[PDB]
Design an enzyme around this catalytic site. Structure first.
Site, mmCIF file in Angstrom:
data_model
loop_
_atom_site.group_PDB
_atom_site.id
_atom_site.type_symbol
_atom_site.label_atom_id
_atom_site.label_comp_id
_atom_site.label_asym_id
_atom_site.label_seq_id
_atom_site.Cartn_x
_atom_site.Cartn_y
_atom_site.Cartn_z
ATOM 1 N N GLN A 152 -10.796 -162.443 24.830
ATOM 2 C CA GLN A 152 -10.330 -162.682 23.474
ATOM 3 C C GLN A 152 -9.313 -163.780 23.284
ATOM 4 O O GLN A 152 -9.327 -164.423 22.244
ATOM 5 C CB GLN A 152 -9.751 -161.371 22.919
ATOM 6 C CG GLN A 152 -10.803 -160.389 22.445
ATOM 7 C CD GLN A 152 -11.441 -160.883 21.167
ATOM 8 O OE1 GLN A 152 -10.796 -161.001 20.124
ATOM 9 N NE2 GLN A 152 -12.711 -161.208 21.239
ATOM 10 N N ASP B 94 0.949 -153.237 25.760
ATOM 11 C CA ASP B 94 0.367 -153.008 24.424
ATOM 12 C C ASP B 94 -0.214 -154.298 23.831
ATOM 13 O O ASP B 94 -1.289 -154.270 23.233
ATOM 14 C CB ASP B 94 1.409 -152.398 23.465
ATOM 15 C CG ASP B 94 1.828 -150.978 23.830
ATOM 16 O OD1 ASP B 94 1.081 -150.308 24.600
ATOM 17 O OD2 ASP B 94 2.890 -150.525 23.334
ATOM 18 N N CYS C 99 -12.370 -150.569 26.975
ATOM 19 C CA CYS C 99 -10.994 -150.600 26.481
ATOM 20 C C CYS C 99 -11.053 -149.937 25.091
ATOM 21 O O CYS C 99 -11.488 -148.782 25.039
ATOM 22 C CB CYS C 99 -10.363 -152.001 26.471
ATOM 23 S SG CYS C 99 -11.376 -153.307 25.729
ATOM 24 N N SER C 100 -10.628 -150.595 24.008
ATOM 25 C CA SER C 100 -10.687 -150.056 22.631
ATOM 26 C C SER C 100 -11.977 -150.594 21.960
ATOM 27 O O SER C 100 -12.939 -149.833 21.769
ATOM 28 C CB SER C 100 -9.444 -150.469 21.830
ATOM 29 O OG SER C 100 -9.224 -151.876 21.896
ATOM 30 N N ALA C 101 -12.018 -151.909 21.663
ATOM 31 C CA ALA C 101 -13.215 -152.543 21.096
ATOM 32 C C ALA C 101 -14.244 -152.928 22.181
ATOM 33 O O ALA C 101 -15.369 -153.269 21.849
ATOM 34 C CB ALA C 101 -12.832 -153.770 20.253
ATOM 35 N N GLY C 102 -13.836 -152.937 23.450
ATOM 36 C CA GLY C 102 -14.730 -153.281 24.564
ATOM 37 C C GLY C 102 -15.020 -154.760 24.742
ATOM 38 O O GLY C 102 -16.086 -155.139 25.258
ATOM 39 N N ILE C 103 -14.083 -155.628 24.321
ATOM 40 C CA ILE C 103 -14.360 -157.070 24.416
ATOM 41 C C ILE C 103 -13.233 -157.881 25.056
ATOM 42 O O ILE C 103 -13.533 -158.793 25.819
ATOM 43 C CB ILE C 103 -14.817 -157.693 23.050
ATOM 44 C CG1 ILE C 103 -13.708 -157.561 21.970
ATOM 45 C CG2 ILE C 103 -16.152 -157.067 22.564
ATOM 46 C CD1 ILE C 103 -14.018 -158.151 20.604
ATOM 47 N N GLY C 104 -11.973 -157.534 24.787
ATOM 48 C CA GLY C 104 -10.826 -158.287 25.309
ATOM 49 C C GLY C 104 -10.470 -157.988 26.745
ATOM 50 O O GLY C 104 -10.811 -158.763 27.658
#
Ligand SMILES: CC1(CN)CCN(c2ncc(Sc3cccnc3C(F)(F)F)c(=O)[nH]2)CC1
Length: 496
Positions: free
Chosen positions: A477, A396, A430-435
């Site tokens: 990130q 998580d 992923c969620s935001a597409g960056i990390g």
């Protein structure tokens, strides 16, 4: 500039800095001392200092009483250009005056305690015309040495050393202007180069590269980076370069595209965004996704929203993508990260003009593979298999403790992509597409070099990341992910 970031100050030092050298509206950002991995925005307001927490567990920068951002520079630019947005009780906090940092620790050209012999060795082996570095003087403590290579073992090139005196808190090269920091000195002599008596122009063209390594020597570099740590210094030096990547993100800010973003301020750069051409005949061309090209391509995108599922399938169709890499669970910590954009096994669904069949699901230890058939409604001959790789064990918060799982997954993704003739870019989200997305893409890029060019190839982790970050904001990130990229590359080379 990113001079408002102070890498080595405590909260106390920050408070005194703002009260003694700042005014109302003065601010700075710093790494958190109380909780490493976090950051603090310290702001002066009504003669008092407020400390605002910025959290980053690997997905985005989350500002307390503020919004979610891809980088600290995008965060600072947003509040410096959108007043009344940052809130305390509800009181408005204004970011007016960046309080500048004099610390050279995160400068690409600064090498601190490095000997004159090591510096001359580095400049001879790795240097080119105009390559430069700044180191601490050992003979005269408190003083510095600027070393520059100029030229084209035949004497056609040379290294020149320039002494930097530190006299009463200011810096000078023996005459002329006296500078408040080494950065101001370097910037000045970059624009206005020192000319030697017989004509040699001491061009400070580019900082000396010390991060490019031969792949076979990764373990050696990882060992050096683990000493007091080296990983943090290198990551923060790469972070300082993010100010050069504030490209326009206008299309994502348009009224009609606002609800198509999972996070309002995490937007695709206009120059690399995926433009959707299907077009239901007002604004049908937008998706929060960017083409990522090394120097095999990728599309880095956010987790679907209920209202972007049809746009996602139009993108997969248009680009001829045959492989999707999902790096998040649908729900993490009770929060929706990505809606289920695929049908149940054996089921057939229509997502606007696109039709998707889930042919078969195969469960592995760390991931699930879904074999999908995608086609356009009313056009049977447009059918193609889309292999969806769903990594389900990423923690998580933070990163996995071992990269074995991720590597075996990536090796499978790579082989599937390689087996499909003229497959378009691999879609990664992923969620935001960056990390996590940027982490998987950077590992994939680096290992792809080791596949093709072999173990004697040159790899440069920060160079690769800066290159991916110029195509989507904040790709990779955190420091945890940065170290995970080195660990993954190390494990790959060791199992070869
Ligand atoms: C001792 C140091 C103290 N600051 C830390 C480690 N080190 C270093 N780390 C990171 C970078 S960034 C970088 C690297 C390669 C290519 N491109 C970039 C870009 F694109 F980001 F500019 C750098 O230039 N050098 C040398 C200086």
């Amino acid at each position: 500039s990113r001079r408002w970031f102070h890498p080595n100050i405590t909260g106390v030092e920050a408070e005194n800095l703002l009260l003694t050298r700042g005014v109302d509206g003065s601010f700075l950002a710093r790494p958190s001392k109380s909780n490493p991995g976090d950051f603090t925005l310290s702001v002066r307001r009504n003669g008092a200092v407020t400390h605002i927490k910025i959290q980053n567990t690997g997905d985005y920068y989350d500002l307390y009483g503020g919004e979610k951002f891809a980088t600290l520079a995008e965060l600072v630019q947003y509040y410096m250009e959108h007043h009344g947005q940052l809130k305390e009780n509800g009181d408005v906090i204004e970011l007016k005056y960046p309080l500048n940092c004099a610390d050279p620790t995160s400068e690409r050209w600064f090498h601190g305690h490095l000997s004159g012999k090591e510096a001359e060795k580095l400049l001879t082996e790795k240097g080119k015309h105009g390559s430069f570095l700044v180191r601490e003087s050992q003979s005269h403590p408190g003083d510095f040495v600027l070393s520059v290579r100029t030229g084209d073992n035949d004497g056609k090139s040379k290294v020149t050393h320039v002494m930097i005196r530190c006299q009463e808190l200011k810096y000078d090269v023996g005459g002329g202007e006296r500078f408040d920091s080494l950065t101001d000195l370097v910037e000045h002599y970059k624009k206005n180069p020192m000319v030697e008596t017989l004509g040699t122009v001491l061009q400070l063209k580019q900082p000396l590269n010390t991060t490019r390594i031969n792949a076979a020597e990764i373990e050696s570099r990882v060992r050096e980076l683990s000493k007091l740590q080296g990983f943090w210094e290198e990551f923060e030096t790469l972070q300082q370069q993010e100010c050069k990547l504030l490209y326009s993100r206008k299309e994502g800010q348009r009224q009609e595209n606002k609800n198509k973003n999972r996070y309002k301020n995490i937007l695709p750069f206009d120059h690399t965004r995926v433009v959707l051409h299907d077009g239901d005949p007002p604004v049908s061309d937008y998706i929060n996704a960017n083409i990522i090209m090394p120097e095999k391509s990728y599309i880095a995108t956010q987790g679907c929203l209920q209202n972007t599922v049809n746009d996602f399938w139009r993108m997969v169709f248009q680009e001829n993508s045959r492989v999707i890499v999902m790096t998040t669970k649908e729900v993490e910590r009770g929060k929706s990260k990505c809606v289920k954009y695929w049908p149940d096994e054996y089921a057939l669904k229509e997502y606007g003009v696109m039709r998707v069949r889930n042919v078969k699901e195969s469960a592995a230890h760390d991931y699930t593979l879904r074999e999908l058939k995608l086609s356009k409604v009313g056009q049977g001959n447009t059918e193609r298999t889309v292999w969806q790789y769903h990594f389900r064990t990423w923690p998580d918060h933070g990163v996995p403790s071992d990269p074995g799982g991720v590597l075996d997954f990536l090796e499978e993704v790579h082989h599937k992509q390689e087996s499909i003739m003229d497959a378009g870019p691999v879609v990664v989200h992923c969620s935001a597409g960056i990390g996590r997305t940027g982490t998987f893409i950077v590992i994939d890029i680096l290992i792809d070099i080791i596949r093709e060019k072999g173990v004697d190839c040159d790899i440069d982790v920060p160079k690769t990341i800066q290159m991916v970050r110029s195509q989507r904001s904040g790709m990779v990130q955190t420091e945890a992910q940065y170290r995970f990229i080195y660990m993954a590359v190390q494990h790959y080379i060791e199992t070869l």
